[PDB]
Scaffold this active site. Structure first.
Site, PDB file in Angstrom:
ATOM      1  N   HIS A  71      -7.046  -6.029   3.095  1.00  0.00           N
ATOM      2  CA  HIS A  71      -5.755  -6.003   3.792  1.00  0.00           C
ATOM      3  C   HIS A  71      -5.022  -4.649   3.662  1.00  0.00           C
ATOM      4  CE1 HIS A  71      -3.941  -7.706   0.016  1.00  0.00           C
ATOM      5  NE2 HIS A  71      -3.144  -6.666   0.237  1.00  0.00           N
ATOM      6  N   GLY A 103       2.820  -3.867  -3.859  1.00  0.00           N
ATOM      7  CA  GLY A 103       2.115  -2.684  -4.322  1.00  0.00           C
ATOM      8  C   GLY A 103       1.092  -2.994  -5.406  1.00  0.00           C
ATOM      9  N   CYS A 109      -1.347  -5.323  -5.322  1.00  0.00           N
ATOM     10  CA  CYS A 109      -2.682  -5.731  -4.835  1.00  0.00           C
ATOM     11  C   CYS A 109      -3.724  -4.686  -5.166  1.00  0.00           C
ATOM     12  CB  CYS A 109      -2.709  -6.091  -3.351  1.00  0.00           C
ATOM     13  SG  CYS A 109      -1.917  -7.667  -2.936  1.00  0.00           S
TER      14      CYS A 109
END
Ligand SMILES: *CC(=O)N1Cc2ccccc2[C@@H](c2cccc(C)c2)C1
Ligand SMILES: *CC(=O)N1Cc2ccccc2[C@@H](c2cccc(C)c2)C1
EC number: 3.4.19.12
Lengths: 304, 304
Positions: free
Chosen positions: A41, A143, A145
């Site tokens: 993503h 932030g 991930c």
């Protein structure tokens, strides 16, 4: 003596964290050898997250669109591929700090450490458990991930988790390092509800053994039980069923303390039925389930 | 979202851990620049610990009696001195992995991370608080002495603790990096009892703000209190008195949530008087006091 929720030393993993930017999205990457692993993503805008077609979105991305920065230096991306829900970015430089490593897919009840990162920089380390509903209860802001979960056996880092998302209830979901989500979760901004968060019975028993080893013995009773009798009580309290495999794993703790596993099960049964009555066990007013029998042995023996 | 007991990334400190052996005693040392810091009781036998005269014991020790090993390589000891309860071993090689550092003496209520080590090797990392009775509740077995406590501000490691001993009750005592014990403890195998382990009120309030930020709001009530009224309740429950300095430090958390500090004090007062009633706050059935207001801000904002 003393028993703490302990995370693995994070150094080996800190040397692997990089920042990955694609367009306007910045998250964390894991740099092992000449490959940077990150959630797929990274290619999405917040708008894309509603219903992303990752293969389609990826067609518009080239090697030069993935900006990888390790410390204050830029890595050259010479290849990219999607494996399940992770992107693998081939870089032209092998990470000089790559430790010995494995990618492992853990089972519910297993614990691991998370090195929470933002912009490729580590902010902190904590100990998690893969819940029986395949979520984790972490501490992750936007932030974070790409932050990873891991276990260490002497010098080999076994990576087991990569953070991808937060469910609407504030619990967390992610994948193993092959990009496969734990549980039924999908990397989409859609309402996904978790199942029952049951208690990891074998872990509670392991922590009850750690308590006895460390002096907390008030809860030990004069009773015993059977697996079937214990499990009738465990089902009622949303505890995972205890198996003979779990009894076998607790064997070393039973041997060290001289308390038979089924006797500890009876103590746990009375604790579930009677409550703590305002008392604590290892400084906790609830039954801790994020220590495996192996963690208890490791901490009580000082494995480095 | 999610709130965890988080330790600092330990990498910078892992690069400083060495093994120090004097005769038959092996403990941990901290190697910064060309100096190795370790507890002075490395020169003692278990028998010496009963009533050690360290200056006298040290006369029989030469530079070559202190065996310092960093990884699998031996460091050459070219000098040694005693500063309070720590030995400073001058080595001929500056630690190439020395981070930017400071030695700080913390106040009770302040939190820090501990990198527990055995034979100079890290086994794990956890978060502690210097208790109001100057003990810490760590996880330390024999061989763990010399393990250090620290805080990190971006790239500067502030070392605040070095482990020296366990009291007969299983709580821990140690020094700052100048060798001065926290509290009244002495490095001798003599019965030393700790004073009242009161609850760090300002830390509980900070953790109540973290709970609100993360969705746990059931405990918020319709009441307010005054510092004096709150403190009458705090004294009764063995909580540290709350000062206007503590109220000032909670200001940013009060601003972010819109809950006045004295209103949170009234919520805490009702929690003390009424109990949790079988409920939890951030997955805990007791009021957590090992997060400072600064830790809450740091974790809730993602400082790296
Ligand atoms: C973990 C993390 O930092 N984020 C931020 C983010 C940036 C760009 C796109 C998507 C996200 C977040 C997200 C939302 C919905 C679903 C999933 C899988 C991730 C997570
Ligand atoms: C912290 C630790 O590992 N030890 C082991 C040890 C080895 C040699 C001498 C003394 C000790 C222990 C000890 C006992 C009594 C008092 C103090 C200050 C330390 C601690």
């Amino acid at each position: 003596s003393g028993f703490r929720k302990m995370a693995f030393p994070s150094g080996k993993v800190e040397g692997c964290m990089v920042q990955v930017t694609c367009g306007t999205t910045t998250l964390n990457g894991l740099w092992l050898d000449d490959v940077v692993y990150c959630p797929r993503h990274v290619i999405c805008t917040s708008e894309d997250m509603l219903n992303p077609n990752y293969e389609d979105l990826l067609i518009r991305k080239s090697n030069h669109n993935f900006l990888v920065q390790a410390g204050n230096v830029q890595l050259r991306v010479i290849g990219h591929s999607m494996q399940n829900c992770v992107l693998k970015l081939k870089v032209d430089t092998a990470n000089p700090k790559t430790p010995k490593y494995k990618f492992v897919r853990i089972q519910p009840g297993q614990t691991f450490s998370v090195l929470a990162c933002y912009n490729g920089s580590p902010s902190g380390v904590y100990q998690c458990a893969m819940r029986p509903n395949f979520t984790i209860k972490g501490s992750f802001l936007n932030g974070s991930c790409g932050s990873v979960g891991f276990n260490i056996d002497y010098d080999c880092v076994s990576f087991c988790y990569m953070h991808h998302m937060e469910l609407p209830t504030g619990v967390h979901a992610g994948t193993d390092l092959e990009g496969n989500f734990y549980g039924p979760f999908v990397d989409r901004q859609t309402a996904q509800a978790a199942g029952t968060d049951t208690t990891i019975t074998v872990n509670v028993l392991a922590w009850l053994y750690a308590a006895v080893i460390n002096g907390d013995r008030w809860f030990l009773n004069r009773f015993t039980t059977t697996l079937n009798d214990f499990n009738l009580v465990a089902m009622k309290y949303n505890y995972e069923p205890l198996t003979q495999d779990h009894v076998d794993i607790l064997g070393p703790l039973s041997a060290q303390t001289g308390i038979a596993v089924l006797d500890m099960c009876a103590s746990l049964k009375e604790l579930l039925q009677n409550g703590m009555n305002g008392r604590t066990i290892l400084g906790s007013a609830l039954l801790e389930d994020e220590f495996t029998p192996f963690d208890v042995v490791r901490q009580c023996s000082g494995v480095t």
